[PDB]
Protein backbone atom coordinates (compact mmCIF):
# COMPACT_ATOMS: atom_id res chain seq x y z
CA UNK A 1 0.00 0.00 0.00
CA UNK A 2 1.42 3.35 -1.15
CA UNK A 3 4.43 1.66 -2.73
CA UNK A 4 5.18 4.36 -5.28
CA UNK A 5 4.66 7.16 -2.80
CA UNK A 6 7.07 5.55 -0.33
CA UNK A 7 9.80 5.20 -2.97
CA UNK A 8 9.32 8.83 -4.08
CA UNK A 9 9.38 10.10 -0.52
CA UNK A 10 12.46 8.06 0.41
CA UNK A 11 14.51 9.15 -2.61
CA UNK A 12 13.45 12.79 -2.36
CA UNK A 13 14.44 12.92 1.31
CA UNK A 14 17.65 11.01 0.57
CA UNK A 15 18.84 13.47 -2.07
CA UNK A 16 17.84 16.45 0.10
CA UNK A 17 19.66 14.84 3.07
CA UNK A 18 22.98 14.75 1.18
CA UNK A 19 22.54 18.36 0.07
CA UNK A 20 21.83 19.62 3.53
CA UNK A 21 24.67 17.56 5.10
CA UNK A 22 27.04 18.95 2.47
CA UNK A 23 25.87 22.57 2.92
CA UNK A 24 25.89 22.67 6.74
CA UNK A 25 29.34 24.30 7.22
CA UNK A 26 29.20 26.47 4.08
CA UNK A 27 25.95 28.01 5.30
CA UNK A 28 27.42 28.41 8.80
CA UNK A 29 30.67 30.10 7.71
CA UNK A 30 28.80 32.27 5.21
CA UNK A 31 25.90 33.07 7.59
CA UNK A 32 25.73 36.65 6.27
CA UNK A 33 24.51 35.94 2.69
CA UNK A 34 22.71 32.56 2.81
CA UNK A 35 20.52 33.19 5.94
CA UNK A 36 17.30 35.23 5.70
CA UNK A 37 15.07 36.21 8.64
CA UNK A 38 11.30 35.52 8.31
CA UNK A 39 8.35 37.54 9.69
CA UNK A 40 8.54 35.74 13.07
CA UNK A 41 12.33 36.30 13.18
CA UNK A 42 13.08 32.62 12.43
CA UNK A 43 15.93 31.79 10.04
CA UNK A 44 15.67 30.40 6.49
CA UNK A 45 18.76 29.46 4.46
CA UNK A 46 19.77 28.30 1.01
CA UNK A 47 19.63 24.76 2.45
CA UNK A 48 15.95 25.05 3.46
CA UNK A 49 14.94 26.26 -0.01
CA UNK A 50 17.16 23.82 -1.93
CA UNK A 51 15.78 20.86 0.06
CA UNK A 52 12.21 22.09 -0.56
CA UNK A 53 12.93 22.44 -4.30
CA UNK A 54 14.39 18.96 -4.64
CA UNK A 55 11.54 17.27 -2.75
CA UNK A 56 8.58 19.09 -4.37
CA UNK A 57 10.13 18.67 -7.81
CA UNK A 58 10.44 14.90 -7.18
CA UNK A 59 6.82 14.79 -5.92
CA UNK A 60 5.48 16.71 -8.93
CA UNK A 61 7.55 14.74 -11.47
CA UNK A 62 5.99 11.55 -10.12
CA UNK A 63 2.53 12.88 -9.12
CA UNK A 64 1.78 16.01 -11.20
CA UNK A 65 -1.47 17.02 -9.55
CA UNK A 66 -0.47 16.42 -5.94
CA UNK A 67 -0.99 19.05 -3.27
CA UNK A 68 1.84 20.05 -0.95
CA UNK A 69 1.92 21.95 2.32
CA UNK A 70 5.58 23.10 2.58
CA UNK A 71 6.99 25.47 5.12
CA UNK A 72 8.77 27.81 2.74
CA UNK A 73 7.83 30.33 0.05
CA UNK A 74 9.96 31.93 -2.70
CA UNK A 75 8.18 35.31 -2.42
CA UNK A 76 10.72 38.14 -2.38
CA UNK A 77 13.84 36.05 -2.99
CA UNK A 78 16.22 37.86 -5.29
CA UNK A 79 17.60 36.29 -8.46
CA UNK A 80 21.06 36.14 -6.86
CA UNK A 81 19.64 34.17 -3.95
CA UNK A 82 17.69 31.83 -6.23
CA UNK A 83 20.81 31.34 -8.38
CA UNK A 84 22.55 30.12 -5.20
CA UNK A 85 19.70 27.69 -4.56
CA UNK A 86 20.02 26.32 -8.11
CA UNK A 87 23.80 26.02 -7.83
CA UNK A 88 23.64 24.06 -4.60
CA UNK A 89 21.10 21.70 -6.20
CA UNK A 90 23.32 21.14 -9.21
CA UNK A 91 26.51 20.75 -7.16
CA UNK A 92 24.70 18.16 -5.07
CA UNK A 93 23.53 16.41 -8.27
CA UNK A 94 27.15 15.99 -9.39
CA UNK A 95 28.16 14.30 -6.12
CA UNK A 96 24.92 12.36 -5.75
CA UNK A 97 24.72 10.88 -9.25
CA UNK A 98 28.27 9.47 -8.93
CA UNK A 99 27.40 7.31 -5.98
CA UNK A 100 23.71 7.13 -5.13
CA UNK A 101 21.62 7.28 -8.31
CA UNK A 102 18.49 5.12 -8.04
CA UNK A 103 17.74 3.09 -11.15
CA UNK A 104 14.36 3.79 -12.69
CA UNK A 105 13.57 6.76 -10.45
CA UNK A 106 13.05 10.34 -11.69
CA UNK A 107 13.75 13.51 -9.71
CA UNK A 108 12.85 15.75 -12.69
CA UNK A 109 11.11 15.34 -16.03
CA UNK A 110 9.87 17.19 -19.08
CA UNK A 111 7.13 19.06 -17.22
CA UNK A 112 9.28 19.92 -14.18
CA UNK A 113 12.88 20.03 -15.43
CA UNK A 114 14.37 22.08 -12.64
CA UNK A 115 16.66 24.05 -14.89
CA UNK A 116 15.94 27.73 -14.45
CA UNK A 117 15.54 30.31 -11.72
CA UNK A 118 11.81 30.47 -12.66
CA UNK A 119 11.59 26.68 -12.24
CA UNK A 120 13.00 27.00 -8.69
CA UNK A 121 10.50 29.71 -7.70
CA UNK A 122 7.56 27.77 -9.16
CA UNK A 123 8.52 24.51 -7.45
CA UNK A 124 9.07 26.10 -4.07
CA UNK A 125 5.64 27.79 -4.38
CA UNK A 126 3.79 24.54 -5.01
CA UNK A 127 4.16 24.13 -1.22
CA UNK A 128 1.41 26.77 -0.64
CA UNK A 129 -1.48 24.39 0.13
CA UNK A 130 -3.34 25.03 3.39
CA UNK A 131 -4.14 21.38 4.23
CA UNK A 132 -7.48 20.35 5.71
CA UNK A 133 -9.83 17.55 6.55
CA UNK A 134 -10.39 15.83 3.23
CA UNK A 135 -8.20 14.35 0.57
CA UNK A 136 -4.54 13.66 -0.02
CA UNK A 137 -1.72 16.10 0.46
CA UNK A 138 1.99 16.08 1.22
CA UNK A 139 3.42 17.79 4.29
CA UNK A 140 7.02 18.99 4.15
CA UNK A 141 9.57 20.63 6.46
CA UNK A 142 12.65 20.84 4.22
CA UNK A 143 14.99 21.50 7.11
CA UNK A 144 13.20 20.84 10.49
CA UNK A 145 15.31 22.51 13.15
CA UNK A 146 17.06 25.21 11.09
CA UNK A 147 18.60 26.56 14.28
CA UNK A 148 20.11 23.10 14.97
CA UNK A 149 21.36 23.06 11.35
CA UNK A 150 22.97 26.50 11.87
CA UNK A 151 24.62 25.35 15.13
CA UNK A 152 26.20 22.44 13.23
CA UNK A 153 24.15 20.02 15.35
CA UNK A 154 20.99 17.94 14.66
CA UNK A 155 18.32 18.71 12.07
CA UNK A 156 15.97 16.60 9.94
CA UNK A 157 14.43 16.58 6.47
CA UNK A 158 10.78 15.66 6.98
CA UNK A 159 8.07 14.55 4.60
CA UNK A 160 4.67 12.94 5.16
CA UNK A 161 1.54 12.16 3.22
CA UNK A 162 -1.80 12.96 4.88
CA UNK A 163 -5.08 11.48 3.60
CA UNK A 164 -8.41 12.54 5.06
CA UNK A 165 -6.59 14.25 7.91
CA UNK A 166 -4.64 11.16 9.02
CA UNK A 167 -0.90 10.67 8.38
CA UNK A 168 -0.46 7.62 6.16
CA UNK A 169 3.26 7.81 5.38
CA UNK A 170 6.27 9.48 6.96
CA UNK A 171 9.93 9.82 6.03
CA UNK A 172 12.54 11.60 8.12
CA UNK A 173 16.17 12.05 7.05
CA UNK A 174 18.55 12.81 9.97
CA UNK A 175 21.78 13.61 8.12
CA UNK A 176 23.94 14.24 11.17
CA UNK A 177 22.56 11.66 13.57
CA UNK A 178 25.34 9.45 15.00
CA UNK A 179 23.77 6.69 17.18
CA UNK A 180 27.01 6.12 19.10
CA UNK A 181 26.44 9.58 20.64
CA UNK A 182 23.44 8.08 22.44
CA UNK A 183 24.26 4.57 23.64
CA UNK A 184 23.78 2.53 20.52
CA UNK A 185 25.47 1.12 17.46
CA UNK A 186 25.82 2.75 14.07
CA UNK A 187 25.15 0.84 10.88
CA UNK A 188 27.45 0.39 7.91
CA UNK A 189 27.40 3.51 5.73
CA UNK A 190 25.94 5.93 8.30
CA UNK A 191 28.92 8.28 8.10
CA UNK A 192 28.28 9.91 4.74
CA UNK A 193 24.82 11.40 5.40
CA UNK A 194 23.23 9.74 8.42
CA UNK A 195 19.98 7.80 8.52
CA UNK A 196 16.52 7.72 6.93
CA UNK A 197 13.54 6.55 9.03
CA UNK A 198 10.19 5.75 7.42
CA UNK A 199 6.78 4.19 7.95
CA UNK A 200 3.49 3.56 6.24
CA UNK A 201 0.36 3.19 8.42
CA UNK A 202 -0.30 -0.48 9.14
CA UNK A 203 3.07 -1.68 7.77
CA UNK A 204 5.67 -0.96 10.46
CA UNK A 205 8.50 1.51 10.96
CA UNK A 206 11.98 1.07 9.49
CA UNK A 207 15.36 2.76 9.09
CA UNK A 208 18.49 2.57 6.94
CA UNK A 209 21.70 4.54 6.47
CA UNK A 210 20.82 7.33 4.01
CA UNK A 211 23.56 6.14 1.66
CA UNK A 212 21.94 2.67 1.54
CA UNK A 213 18.16 3.27 1.68
CA UNK A 214 17.71 -0.19 0.13
CA UNK A 215 18.17 -2.50 3.12
CA UNK A 216 15.58 -1.57 5.77
CA UNK A 217 15.74 -2.60 9.44
CA UNK A 218 12.53 -2.69 11.49
CA UNK A 219 12.35 -0.56 14.65
CA UNK A 220 10.19 -0.53 17.73
CA UNK A 221 9.85 1.46 20.91
CA UNK A 222 11.28 -0.10 24.07
CA UNK A 223 9.27 -0.92 27.19
CA UNK A 224 10.90 0.06 30.47
CA UNK A 225 8.82 -0.49 33.58
CA UNK A 226 10.06 2.12 36.02
CA UNK A 227 9.95 5.82 35.17
CA UNK A 228 13.07 6.24 37.34
CA UNK A 229 15.06 4.47 34.58
CA UNK A 230 13.53 6.35 31.65
CA UNK A 231 15.06 8.93 29.33
CA UNK A 232 13.33 12.09 28.09
CA UNK A 233 13.67 13.73 24.68
CA UNK A 234 13.54 17.53 24.63
CA UNK A 235 14.61 20.31 22.25
CA UNK A 236 17.65 22.56 22.82
CA UNK A 237 15.96 25.89 22.00
CA UNK A 238 14.46 27.29 25.19
CA UNK A 239 11.82 29.28 23.28
CA UNK A 240 10.34 26.17 21.64
CA UNK A 241 9.08 24.47 24.78
CA UNK A 242 8.74 25.02 28.52
CA UNK A 243 11.94 23.48 29.90
CA UNK A 244 11.17 24.43 33.51
CA UNK A 245 7.78 22.75 33.42
CA UNK A 246 9.36 19.75 31.71
CA UNK A 247 11.84 19.64 34.60
CA UNK A 248 8.90 19.62 37.00
CA UNK A 249 7.46 16.60 35.16
CA UNK A 250 10.83 14.82 35.29
CA UNK A 251 11.24 15.52 39.03
CA UNK A 252 7.74 14.20 39.77
CA UNK A 253 8.44 10.99 37.82
CA UNK A 254 11.98 10.59 39.23
CA UNK A 255 13.48 10.80 35.72
CA UNK A 256 17.15 11.80 35.83
CA UNK A 257 18.25 11.17 32.23
CA UNK A 258 17.51 13.46 29.35
CA UNK A 259 18.59 13.99 25.77
CA UNK A 260 18.38 17.42 24.19
CA UNK A 261 18.50 17.76 20.41
CA UNK A 262 16.80 19.73 17.65
CA UNK A 263 14.22 18.38 15.17
CA UNK A 264 12.08 15.35 14.53
CA UNK A 265 15.23 13.23 14.95
CA UNK A 266 13.76 13.08 18.51
CA UNK A 267 10.82 11.01 17.27
CA UNK A 268 13.30 8.74 15.39
CA UNK A 269 15.25 7.98 18.60
CA UNK A 270 11.96 7.27 20.43
CA UNK A 271 10.90 4.94 17.61
CA UNK A 272 14.31 3.19 17.67
CA UNK A 273 13.89 2.51 21.41
CA UNK A 274 16.71 4.73 22.64
CA UNK A 275 14.54 7.01 24.80
CA UNK A 276 11.09 6.83 26.35
CA UNK A 277 9.29 10.16 26.53
CA UNK A 278 9.28 13.18 24.15
CA UNK A 279 8.15 16.32 25.99
CA UNK A 280 7.10 19.53 24.25
CA UNK A 281 4.99 21.69 26.58
CA UNK A 282 4.03 25.16 25.35
CA UNK A 283 5.36 28.29 27.13
CA UNK A 284 2.54 30.35 25.60
CA UNK A 285 -0.85 28.73 25.04
CA UNK A 286 -1.63 30.85 21.95
CA UNK A 287 1.00 28.99 19.88
CA UNK A 288 -0.34 26.48 17.33
CA UNK A 289 2.16 23.79 16.34
CA UNK A 290 2.86 23.44 12.64
CA UNK A 291 1.76 20.14 11.11
CA UNK A 292 5.14 19.79 9.37
CA UNK A 293 6.89 19.67 12.76
CA UNK A 294 5.01 16.51 13.78
CA UNK A 295 3.28 14.65 10.91
CA UNK A 296 6.20 12.46 9.77
CA UNK A 297 7.00 11.49 13.35
CA UNK A 298 3.36 10.73 14.15
CA UNK A 299 3.15 7.71 11.80
CA UNK A 300 6.74 6.58 12.56
CA UNK A 301 6.06 6.56 16.31
CA UNK A 302 2.65 4.87 15.82
CA UNK A 303 4.18 2.13 13.69
CA UNK A 304 7.03 1.62 16.15
CA UNK A 305 4.38 0.97 18.81
CA UNK A 306 4.42 4.30 20.65
CA UNK A 307 1.73 6.84 21.58
CA UNK A 308 1.36 10.48 20.47
CA UNK A 309 -0.92 13.14 21.90
CA UNK A 310 -1.08 16.78 22.94
CA UNK A 311 0.53 17.87 26.23
CA UNK A 312 -2.62 18.74 28.22
CA UNK A 313 -5.87 16.99 27.26
CA UNK A 314 -4.33 13.64 26.36
CA UNK A 315 -6.09 13.46 22.97
CA UNK A 316 -4.63 12.33 19.64
CA UNK A 317 -3.18 14.98 17.35
CA UNK A 318 -5.50 15.99 14.50
CA UNK A 319 -3.64 16.54 11.21
CA UNK A 320 -6.82 17.63 9.42
CA UNK A 321 -7.10 21.13 10.91
CA UNK A 322 -5.08 22.91 8.21
CA UNK A 323 -1.45 24.01 8.61
CA UNK A 324 -1.57 23.94 12.41
CA UNK A 325 -2.58 21.72 15.33
CA UNK A 326 -5.39 23.21 17.46
CA UNK A 327 -4.28 21.41 20.65
CA UNK A 328 -1.61 22.67 23.08
CA UNK A 329 1.83 21.07 23.19
CA UNK A 330 2.88 17.58 22.11
CA UNK A 331 3.89 14.51 24.13
CA UNK A 332 4.97 11.17 22.72
CA UNK A 333 6.16 8.04 24.49
CA UNK A 334 6.86 4.33 24.21
CA UNK A 335 3.52 3.64 25.99
CA UNK A 336 1.84 1.76 27.36
CA UNK A 337 -1.34 3.78 27.89
CA UNK A 338 -0.75 3.87 31.65
CA UNK A 339 2.69 5.43 31.26
CA UNK A 340 1.49 7.91 28.62
CA UNK A 341 -1.53 9.02 30.65
CA UNK A 342 0.68 9.44 33.76
CA UNK A 343 2.98 11.75 31.77
CA UNK A 344 0.20 13.78 30.14
CA UNK A 345 -1.84 14.20 33.39
CA UNK A 346 1.32 15.36 35.13
CA UNK A 347 1.83 17.85 32.31
CA UNK A 348 -1.75 19.16 32.59
CA UNK A 349 -1.35 19.52 36.38
CA UNK A 350 1.95 21.40 36.10
CA UNK A 351 0.49 23.76 33.45
CA UNK A 352 -2.71 24.37 35.41
CA UNK A 353 -0.62 25.15 38.52
CA UNK A 354 0.85 28.31 36.92
N1 LIG B 1 7.39 29.37 19.80
C2 LIG B 1 7.52 28.13 19.34
N3 LIG B 1 6.95 27.09 19.96
C4 LIG B 1 7.03 25.78 19.51
N5 LIG B 1 7.66 25.45 18.40
C6 LIG B 1 8.21 26.46 17.74
C7 LIG B 1 8.24 27.82 18.13
N8 LIG B 1 8.94 28.58 17.24
C9 LIG B 1 9.36 27.74 16.30
N10 LIG B 1 8.96 26.43 16.58
C11 LIG B 1 9.22 25.18 15.78
O12 LIG B 1 10.21 24.44 16.45
C13 LIG B 1 10.48 23.50 15.33
C14 LIG B 1 11.77 22.76 15.70
O15 LIG B 1 11.56 22.06 17.00
P16 LIG B 1 12.78 21.57 17.86
O17 LIG B 1 14.03 21.36 17.09
O18 LIG B 1 12.32 20.37 18.48
O19 LIG B 1 12.99 22.59 18.97
C20 LIG B 1 10.59 24.36 14.08
O21 LIG B 1 10.47 23.57 12.91
C22 LIG B 1 9.60 25.50 14.34
O23 LIG B 1 8.39 25.39 13.53
MG1 LIG C 1 11.72 27.70 9.70
MG1 LIG D 1 11.86 24.03 8.56
Residue 240 annotated in ligand binding: yes
Q: Is the CB of 148 under 6 A from ligand 1?
A: yes
CA 289, 285, 39: angle at the middle one, nearest 5?
55
Beta carbons of 50 and 19 less than 8 angstroms apart: yes
Substitution candidate for ligand 1 out of 237, 292, 329 with most atoms within 8 A of CB: 237
Cis? peptide before 336, omega within 30° of 0 = yes
- As a whole number of angstroms, the distance between CA 207 and CA 271 comes to 10
Residue 144 annotated in ligand binding: yes
Beta carbons of 196 and 322 less than 8 angstroms apart: no
Distance (Å) from CA 5 to ligand 2 centroid: 25
Which residue puts its alpha carbon closest to atom 1 of ligand 1?
Answer: 240
- As a whole number of angstroms, the distance between CA 293 and CA 201 comes to 18
Substitution candidate for ligand 1 out of 240, 260, 275, 332 with most atoms within 8 A of CB: 240
Q: Is the CB of 154 under 6 A from ligand 1?
A: no
- As a whole number of angstroms, the distance between CA 161 and CA 63 comes to 12
Element (H, E) at 267: helix 265-272
Q: For residue 164, what are the CA distances in angstroms to 3, 133, 167? A: 19, 5, 8
Kindly provide the resolution of this structure in angstroms, with one decimal.
1.6
Residue 141 annotated in ligand binding: yes
CATH superfamily of 1-219: Fructose-1,6-Bisphosphatase, subunit A, domain 1 (3.30.540.10)
Q: Is the CB of 260 under 6 A from ligand 1?
A: no
Distance (Å) from CA 240 to ligand 1 centroid: 5
Q: What are the sequence ranges of the domains in the chain?
A: 1-219, 220-354
Q: Is the CB of 293 under 6 A from ligand 1?
A: yes
Element (H, E) at 259: strand 257-260
- As a whole number of angstroms, the distance between CA 183 and CA 179 comes to 7
Q: Is the CB of 216 under 6 A from ligand 1?
A: no
Give the method used: X-ray
Distance (Å) from CA 49 to ligand 3 centroid: 9
Give the architecture-level CATH label for domain 220-354.
3-Layer(aba) Sandwich (3.40)
Q: Is the dihedral of CA 70, 73, 79, 84 positive or negative?
A: negative
Catalytic residues: 48, 146
- Provide CB contacts within 8 A for 15, sequence distance 6+: 54, 58, 92, 96, 100, 107
Q: Is the CB of 240 under 6 A from ligand 1?
A: yes
Atom number in ligand 1 closest to CA 266: 18
Nearest to 210 by CA among 3, 49, 18: 18
- Provide CB contacts within 8 A for 175, sequence distance 6+: 17, 18, 20, 21, 24, 155, 156, 157, 193, 194, 210
Amino acid sequence: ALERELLVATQAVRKASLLTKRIQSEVISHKDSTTITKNDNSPVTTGDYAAQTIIINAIKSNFPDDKVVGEESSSGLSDAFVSGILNEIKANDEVYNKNYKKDDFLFTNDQFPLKSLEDVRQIIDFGNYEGGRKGRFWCLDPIDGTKGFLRGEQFAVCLALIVDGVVQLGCIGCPNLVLSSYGAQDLKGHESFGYIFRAVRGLGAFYSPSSDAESWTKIHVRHLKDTKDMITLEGVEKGHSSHDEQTAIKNKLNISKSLHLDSQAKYCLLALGLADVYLRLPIKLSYQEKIWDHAAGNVIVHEAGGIHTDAMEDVPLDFGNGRTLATKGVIASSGPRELHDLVVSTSCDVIQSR
